[PDB]
Amino acid sequence: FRKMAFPSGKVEGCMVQVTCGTTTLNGLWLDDTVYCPRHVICTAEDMLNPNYEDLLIRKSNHSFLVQAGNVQLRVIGHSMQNCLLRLKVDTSNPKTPKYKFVRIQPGQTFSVLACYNGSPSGVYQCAMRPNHTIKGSFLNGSCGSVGFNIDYDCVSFCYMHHMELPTGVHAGTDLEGKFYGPFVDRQTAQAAGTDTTITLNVLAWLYAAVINGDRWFLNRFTTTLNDFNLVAMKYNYEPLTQDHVDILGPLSAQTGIAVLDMCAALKELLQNGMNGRTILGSTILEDEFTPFDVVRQC
Amino acid sequence: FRKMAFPSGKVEGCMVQVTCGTTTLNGLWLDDTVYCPRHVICTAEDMLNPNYEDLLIRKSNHSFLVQAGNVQLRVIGHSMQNCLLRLKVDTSNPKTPKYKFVRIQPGQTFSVLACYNGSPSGVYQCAMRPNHTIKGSFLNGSCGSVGFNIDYDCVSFCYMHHMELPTGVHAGTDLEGKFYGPFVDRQTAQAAGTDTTITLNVLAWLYAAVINGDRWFLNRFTTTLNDFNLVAMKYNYEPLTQDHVDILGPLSAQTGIAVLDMCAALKELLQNGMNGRTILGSTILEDEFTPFDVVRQC
């Protein structure tokens, strides 16, 4: 099974660089507006505990260098939207697609277009963890990089990168400037919560394995939602709700395997191990595919 | 470690659909030319053993439906370039980037933009296997999808998809229409060779693990190129040449670990296992990252 990301084309045209002083990071250019993390105005020493309102008052419109590759723009209206810097520019982006800002729930997935100083360099698919972090490994020096989904023509922007936490995981915000999780944009004592495994996704990945060719992990045992969440609690998994059962419905019908029987197959994989056998070429239980990601690829 | 693919934007504009009869597949639109697999003219029953010259003679320019989303073009010059259908069109593509056709060596990597009926849907990073296949899992109904690399502005096209082999692996061609491997474009007895592991890439991935944080697999043993290729032959790995040693040079210098010492670290991982310990969150040895892919992300 291949981890697939959305075509990054519609997002690439919206990538600009915001340079404030010695700080340069990526920005999102939509209509006559440029979004970037508000920590761009902080000057490293100021990152320990910043006074953002105080720091913005001493910043003017000519302190921001918005650059769209060869073209340099101009700021006519600097503003602050929660943890985001909303920069009003003179020219509207001719490459602006149909866009909407959504706030994705934990367990859901998105494509990230990683850029470095306004120029896009790579694209990958990741998931929003239950503790609200992302395991993006390298978003280092890519602050401003965005997370998105695509439905035909419409781009659903949902993430902007802000922070690489002291434990190598990544923290960030939605496009309304509001953080995913309890985290602030401040270099301080920021402890991430104990990450659980996204159960729904594991079940979806197993449903995918059935469609491809792997079937050995299926047994004739059954298990209700009560007994399974008891075992899920033990192996640091997310408990499974009745809503998750309803979501897996279309994938149950396609493979002829009831969701509770699939839960019984998972229950067994946690207690009896895997014994060096690979589900879809992987020795571990992959939890970063939603049931909607499985259906769109099958 | 995250598997990163190139931004698909410059390639998305070149995606069209070629519809010949009941057969519809993806096409590459560059200048006043449209490339697609020549098996588009085959009519399923004809796929067992086709006579391509004979089949093309009874095909005219109005038998091909080239469509760029909303815009339908017209064929003025159908031709055959080895296993590729070269279609000359009236209008030149305004979205044509700087492009070059390269033939990638086995062990090297590329980004694939998977499309379905001319419209791009997903993007992922894969590798050209030693047996010349790709493990693309789902390129099903995506014939014509291209494989590429990007250097700043220049797009290096290197792959087009043709065949999903009876063993779930994928076969295809370069953009000059010449197949990677002994394979033909014919639904017949096509056996893929015994796939070996790309050693250079495993060494590169281990070098990457050192830069991130994992260091436990390093020991004080050393091993020359002779003793290692003896062990590599045993575990179905590629033998390591002196050229591969020279390629790993810049990554050796960055981590302070000599390539022969890294080979000694690998030698041990094959004979002593891994004992349920994860290198970069993975229980198996990942072989689809080139040393150039490691450097570009670090």
On whether both A174 and A225 belong to a single domain, the answer is no
Calpha distance B215→B265 (Å, rounded): 10
Q: Do A126 and B213 touch (CB under 8 A)?
A: no
The CB density around residue A220, as the number of other CB atoms within 10 Å, is: 6
Among the partner-chain residues A7, A113, A114, the one whose CB lies closest to the CB of B120 is A7
Boundary-marking domain end, from B63, B97, B131: B97
Chain B positions touching A276 (Cβ under 8 A) are none
Calpha distance B87→B236 (Å, rounded): 43
- For residue B22, what are the CA distances in angstroms to B41, B43, B60, B94, B225? 9, 8, 15, 29, 54
Calpha distance B24→B40 (Å, rounded): 7
Among the partner-chain residues A6, A122, A213, the one whose CB lies closest to the CB of B4 is A122
Residue B93 tokens, joined: 């593509």
Among the partner-chain residues A7, A284, A297, the one whose CB lies closest to the CB of B113 is A7
Nearest chain B CA: its distance from A137 CA (Å)? 6
Residue B159 tokens, joined: 């792959």
Task: Please pick, among B14, B115, B126, B143, the residue that the annotation labels catalytic.
Answer: B143
On whether both B104 and B4 belong to a single domain, the answer is yes
Q: Which among A111, A112, A297, A126 has a CA at the least distance from the CA of A204?
A: A297
Catalytic: A83? no
Q: Which among B65, B55, B79 has a CA at the least distance from the CA of B27?
A: B65
- A29 strand-pairing partners: A34
Residue B280's region, left for phi above 0, alpha for psi from -120 to 50, else beta, is left
Catalytic: B36? no
Q: Do B7 and A121 touch (CB under 8 A)?
A: yes
**Resolution of the coordinates, Å:** 2.8
Residue B171 tokens, joined: 């076969």
Boundary-marking domain end, from A97, A119, A137: A97
On whether both A26 and A160 belong to a single domain, the answer is no
On whether both A204 and A231 belong to a single domain, the answer is yes
Calpha distance A79→A229 (Å, rounded): 46
Q: Find the CATH number of the domain harbouring A278.
A: 1.10.1840.10
* Residue A244 identity (one-letter amino acid): H
On whether both A24 and A154 belong to a single domain, the answer is no
On whether both B8 and B141 belong to a single domain, the answer is yes
Backbone angles phi, psi at A221, to 5 degrees: -80, 150
On whether both B104 and B74 belong to a single domain, the answer is no
Chain A positions touching B278 (Cβ under 8 A) are 284
Paired sense of beta strands A146-151 and A109-116, if any: antiparallel
CB A160 within 8 A of CB A144: yes
On whether both B4 and B36 belong to a single domain, the answer is no
Calpha distance B135→A1 (Å, rounded): 9
Instruction: Say whether A274 sits in a helix, a strand or coil.
Output: coil
Identify the sign of the CA torsion B35, B36, B37, B40: negative
On whether both B5 and B78 belong to a single domain, the answer is no
Q: Which among B129, B104, B105, B110 has a CA at the least distance from the CA of B196?
A: B129
From start to end of chain B, where are the E strands?
15-20, 23-30, 33-37, 65-68, 71-72, 75-81, 84-89, 98-101, 109-116, 119-127, 146-151, 154-164, 170-173
On whether both B296 and B210 belong to a single domain, the answer is yes
Please spell the DSSP secondary structure of A69-87, one letter per residue.
Answer: TTEE--EEEEEEETTEEEE
The CB density around residue B224, as the number of other CB atoms within 10 Å, is: 10
- For residue B127, what are the CA distances in angstroms to A27, B5, B22, B132, B287? 32, 11, 32, 10, 9
Q: Find the CATH number of the domain harbouring A162.
A: 2.40.10.10
**Is residue A151 packed enough to be buried (19+ CB in 10 Å), middle (13-18) or exposed (0-12)?**
exposed
Chain A positions touching B298 (Cβ under 8 A) are 138
Domain total in chain B: 3
On whether both B115 and B58 belong to a single domain, the answer is no
Paired sense of beta strands B15-20 and A170-173, if any: unpaired
On whether both B5 and B121 belong to a single domain, the answer is yes
- For residue A131, what are the CA distances in angstroms to A83, A134, A203, B142, B166? 19, 9, 20, 37, 42
DSSP 8-state assignment for residue B143: T
Q: Which residues of A touch B (CB under 8 A)?
A: 1-9, 12-13, 113-114, 120-124, 126, 135-138, 168, 212-213, 278, 280-284, 296-298
Calpha distance B130→B196 (Å, rounded): 6
- A101 strand-pairing partners: A157
For residue B182, the enclosing domain spans: 1-12+98-195
Boundary-marking domain end, from A137, A167, A195: A195
Residue A131 tokens, joined: 């503790």
Calpha distance A83→A89 (Å, rounded): 19
Which distant-in-sequence residues (6+ apart) come within 8 Å of B60 by Cβ? B78
